[PDB]
Structure formats: structure tokens, C-alpha cells
Scaffold this active site. Structure first.
Site, PDB file in Angstrom:
ATOM      1  N   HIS A 267      -0.253   4.343 -11.024  1.00 19.46           N
ATOM      2  CA  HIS A 267      -0.769   2.962 -11.166  1.00 19.46           C
ATOM      3  C   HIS A 267      -1.198   2.356  -9.827  1.00 19.46           C
ATOM      4  O   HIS A 267      -1.847   1.292  -9.789  1.00 19.46           O
ATOM      5  CB  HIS A 267       0.265   2.087 -11.885  1.00 19.46           C
ATOM      6  CG  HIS A 267       1.565   1.952 -11.152  1.00 19.46           C
ATOM      7  ND1 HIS A 267       1.779   0.994 -10.180  1.00 19.46           N
ATOM      8  CD2 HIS A 267       2.710   2.679 -11.221  1.00 19.46           C
ATOM      9  CE1 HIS A 267       3.008   1.118  -9.703  1.00 19.46           C
ATOM     10  NE2 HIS A 267       3.582   2.152 -10.297  1.00 19.46           N
TER      11      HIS A 267
ATOM     12  N   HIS B 119       2.667  -1.689  -0.185  1.00 19.71           N
ATOM     13  CA  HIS B 119       1.622  -1.265  -1.116  1.00 19.71           C
ATOM     14  C   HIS B 119       0.697  -2.437  -1.357  1.00 19.71           C
ATOM     15  O   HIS B 119       0.915  -3.519  -0.760  1.00 19.71           O
ATOM     16  CB  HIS B 119       2.237  -0.792  -2.444  1.00 19.71           C
ATOM     17  CG  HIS B 119       2.994  -1.865  -3.161  1.00 19.71           C
ATOM     18  ND1 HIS B 119       4.372  -1.886  -3.181  1.00 19.71           N
ATOM     19  CD2 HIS B 119       2.586  -2.943  -3.882  1.00 19.71           C
ATOM     20  CE1 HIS B 119       4.789  -2.934  -3.876  1.00 19.71           C
ATOM     21  NE2 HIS B 119       3.727  -3.591  -4.306  1.00 19.71           N
TER      22      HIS B 119
ATOM     23  N   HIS C 198      -2.013  -4.533  -4.323  1.00 14.94           N
ATOM     24  CA  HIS C 198      -2.571  -4.712  -5.648  1.00 14.94           C
ATOM     25  C   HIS C 198      -4.036  -5.120  -5.488  1.00 14.94           C
ATOM     26  O   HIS C 198      -4.398  -5.749  -4.479  1.00 14.94           O
ATOM     27  CB  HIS C 198      -1.820  -5.777  -6.445  1.00 14.94           C
ATOM     28  CG  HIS C 198      -0.367  -5.472  -6.635  1.00 14.94           C
ATOM     29  ND1 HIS C 198       0.151  -5.002  -7.817  1.00 14.94           N
ATOM     30  CD2 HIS C 198       0.673  -5.591  -5.790  1.00 14.94           C
ATOM     31  CE1 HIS C 198       1.459  -4.844  -7.692  1.00 14.94           C
ATOM     32  NE2 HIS C 198       1.795  -5.171  -6.462  1.00 14.94           N
TER      33      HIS C 198
ATOM     34  N   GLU D 186      -2.200 -10.999  -6.944  1.00 13.49           N
ATOM     35  CA  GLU D 186      -1.184 -11.318  -7.956  1.00 13.49           C
ATOM     36  C   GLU D 186      -0.864 -12.818  -7.894  1.00 13.49           C
ATOM     37  O   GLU D 186      -1.032 -13.532  -8.901  1.00 13.49           O
ATOM     38  CB  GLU D 186       0.045 -10.431  -7.751  1.00 13.49           C
ATOM     39  CG  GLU D 186      -0.297  -8.969  -8.010  1.00 13.49           C
ATOM     40  CD  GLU D 186       0.869  -8.195  -8.569  1.00 13.49           C
ATOM     41  OE1 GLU D 186       1.862  -8.089  -7.839  1.00 13.49           O
ATOM     42  OE2 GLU D 186       0.761  -7.714  -9.689  1.00 13.49           O
TER      43      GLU D 186
ATOM     44  N   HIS E 260       1.844  -6.189  -0.229  1.00 10.63           N
ATOM     45  CA  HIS E 260       3.302  -6.424  -0.444  1.00 10.63           C
ATOM     46  C   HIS E 260       4.098  -5.566   0.522  1.00 10.63           C
ATOM     47  O   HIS E 260       3.925  -4.361   0.523  1.00 10.63           O
ATOM     48  CB  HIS E 260       3.690  -6.078  -1.880  1.00 10.63           C
ATOM     49  CG  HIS E 260       3.222  -7.095  -2.871  1.00 10.63           C
ATOM     50  ND1 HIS E 260       3.167  -6.882  -4.230  1.00 10.63           N
ATOM     51  CD2 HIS E 260       2.772  -8.359  -2.660  1.00 10.63           C
ATOM     52  CE1 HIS E 260       2.724  -7.986  -4.820  1.00 10.63           C
ATOM     53  NE2 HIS E 260       2.467  -8.887  -3.887  1.00 10.63           N
TER      54      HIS E 260
ATOM     55  N   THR F 268       6.913  -7.512  -9.687  1.00  7.67           N
ATOM     56  CA  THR F 268       5.736  -7.851 -10.498  1.00  7.67           C
ATOM     57  C   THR F 268       5.310  -6.790 -11.516  1.00  7.67           C
ATOM     58  O   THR F 268       4.289  -6.943 -12.190  1.00  7.67           O
ATOM     59  CB  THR F 268       4.518  -8.223  -9.628  1.00  7.67           C
ATOM     60  OG1 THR F 268       4.049  -7.060  -8.909  1.00  7.67           O
ATOM     61  CG2 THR F 268       4.884  -9.338  -8.642  1.00  7.67           C
TER      62      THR F 268
END
Ligand SMILES: [Zn+2]
Length: 257
Positions: free
Chosen positions: A61, A91, A93, A103, A116, A196
Site C-alpha cells: 500500500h 513514510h 502518503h 491526510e 510521517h 491512519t
């Protein structure tokens, strides 16, 4: 198995993870007119040793950059914290297009991506596994990424992706200090929240930077060209991995500024 497509995605997570409908879920929209300035919040202090950088992994993902966390070579202190928190991972998003991808949001505004930097409470707990489910167990710095100029500090990370294109691939990733990715101001918001994605534990103290960092359209394309399938299968680009914002349910977002 959970993911981000419509069969296994954010709107479905509550089926195996009922905490998804909890009272301390993340991310959130930060409404700046509703934040409370807190004079008791100390500056954020990060001190990371580039020797702790270990490995980059395609996790299907997303991708993760993991750090050795056997000692306090790399730590987060200050802000709302009395305890020292030990770096373990960073990492990102991102979204399907530049228009969304972060996010957290700020006054309704969606950014293109989000960094993050995750830490665990080594003052109170013996391992990440222990800390991860405790209310005071995790501290994550979130940095909003605004599409614009290419960010040279992302270089090493982006250059590493060609070696981990498909799910499960991993490589050494060494001699890297991720405090180089942080904005120059460490003014921040803080609130009590959660992981999250599954397992969505309400164990995270969020530190959201006021200042964004840059990312180019082409840099974002590199994230999206990672593949979620295993080697040899039909290619499935990792198009997005951001969760929608969740209800504050009466929590207070505090401001350091
Ligand atoms: Zn994350």
C-alpha cells in the site's frame, strides 16, 4: 486484507476494525479559528543519527524507511512531551492527482502529499510492539507537502524506489538523517489521535508542522509508479493511500504559535 481500493478501503475498515469509528481517529481537518494556543508547549527537538537508517521496503500500500531502534541514537523530545521518543520509521502518503493526497487538512485545504516521521515512547515501554497500542505510546510528526518546486532533500529516497518496485521487495537504506526533510520552522499543532490505517490504534500524539515542504508533480509521479502487485503479476500502480479526515469528537487541537 485491507487497502485503499473500494472493496478493502477506508470506508470498509470498520468491519474488521471497529475502532475506525472511534473518538480519537486520525487524520483531522485543523480549523485554525478553533485551535487553542498553549504557552506550556515546548519547542520540538529532533536529534537523529544517520547511522540508524536501515532499510526501505515496498509494503504493497506504501513504502517504509525503517531505522534501528535498539537505543536512543535518534530521538524526538520537547513539544507536549515529558518523555523521549525513539525514531523508528518514516513514510509518505499521496493521492490519485495533485489536488489531494495529504491526510491532514488545514481549514479545508488538501495538500498533494504528507510526510510521517514515527517514534515510540522508549521512556515508558521496552519495544515498539508494546508501545503501539498505548495512549501515550507513539509520536508522529506530519509535514504537509505542497506541489511546486522539486525538493532536492527527497533525492536519496526517490533514487531508492527503482530497487523496490513491487510488493515485498526491500533494500538497505543507510546513512540518512530524516530531520533534513523537515521544514525550517518547527511551529506546530498537536492533538491526540490514531494510526491512519489498520490497526488504527488510538496511540498517537500528532505533531503537525505549520510550514509545508515542497514536492514536484514529477516527484509525486515517482510515488505513484510504485507497484502494489508482486513481481511477475499484472502491474497495479500505487495510485493513492490517504485516509479521509475524521470527526474531532470534541478533541482540542493545540497550537505552539
Ligand atoms: Zn502515515
Amino acid at each position: 486484507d485491507w487497502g485503499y481500493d473500494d472493496k478493502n478501503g477506508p470506508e470498509q475498515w470498520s468491519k474488521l476494525y471497529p475502532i475506525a469509528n472511534g473518538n480519537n481517529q486520525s487524520p483531522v481537518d485543523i480549523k485554525t479559528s478553533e485551535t487553542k494556543h498553549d504557552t506550556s508547549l515546548k519547542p520540538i527537538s529532533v536529534s537523529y543519527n544517520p547511522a540508524t537508517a536501515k532499510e526501505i521496503i515496498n509494503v504493497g500500500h506504501s513504502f517504509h524507511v525503517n531505522f534501528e531502534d535498539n537505543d536512543n541514537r535518534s530521538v524526538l523530545k520537547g513539544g507536549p512531551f515529558s518523555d523521549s521518543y525513539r525514531l523508528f520509521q518514516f513514510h509518505f502518503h499521496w493521492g490519485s492527482t495533485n489536488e489531494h493526497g495529504s491526510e491532514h487538512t488545514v481549514d479545508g485545504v488538501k495538500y498533494s502529499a504528507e510526510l510521517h516521521v514515527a517514534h515510540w515512547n522508549s521512556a515508558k515501554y521496552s519495544s515498539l510492539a508494546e508501545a503501539a497500542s498505548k495512549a501515550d505510546g507513539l509520536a508522529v510528526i506530519g509535514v504537509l507537502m505542497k506541489v511546486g518546486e522539486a525538493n532536492p532533500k527527497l533525492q536519496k529516497v526517490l533514487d531508492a524506489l527503482q530497487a523496490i518496485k513491487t510488493k515485498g521487495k526491500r533494500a538497505p537504506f543507510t546513512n540518512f538523517d530524516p530531520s533534513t526533510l523537515l521544514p525550517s520552522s518547527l511551529d506546530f499543532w498537536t492533538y491526540p489521535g490514531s494510526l491512519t490505517h489498520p490497526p488504527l490504534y488510538e496511540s498517537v500524539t500528532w505533531i503537525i508542522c505549520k510550514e509545508s515542504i515542497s514536492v514536484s508533480s514529477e516527484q509525486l509521479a515517482q510515488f505513484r509508479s510504485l507497484l502494489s502487485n508482486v513481481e511477475g503479476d499484472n502491474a497495479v500502480p500505487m495510485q493513492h493511500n490517504n485516509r479521509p479526515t475524521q470527526p474531532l469528537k470534541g478533541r482540542t487541537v493545540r497550537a505552539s504559535f
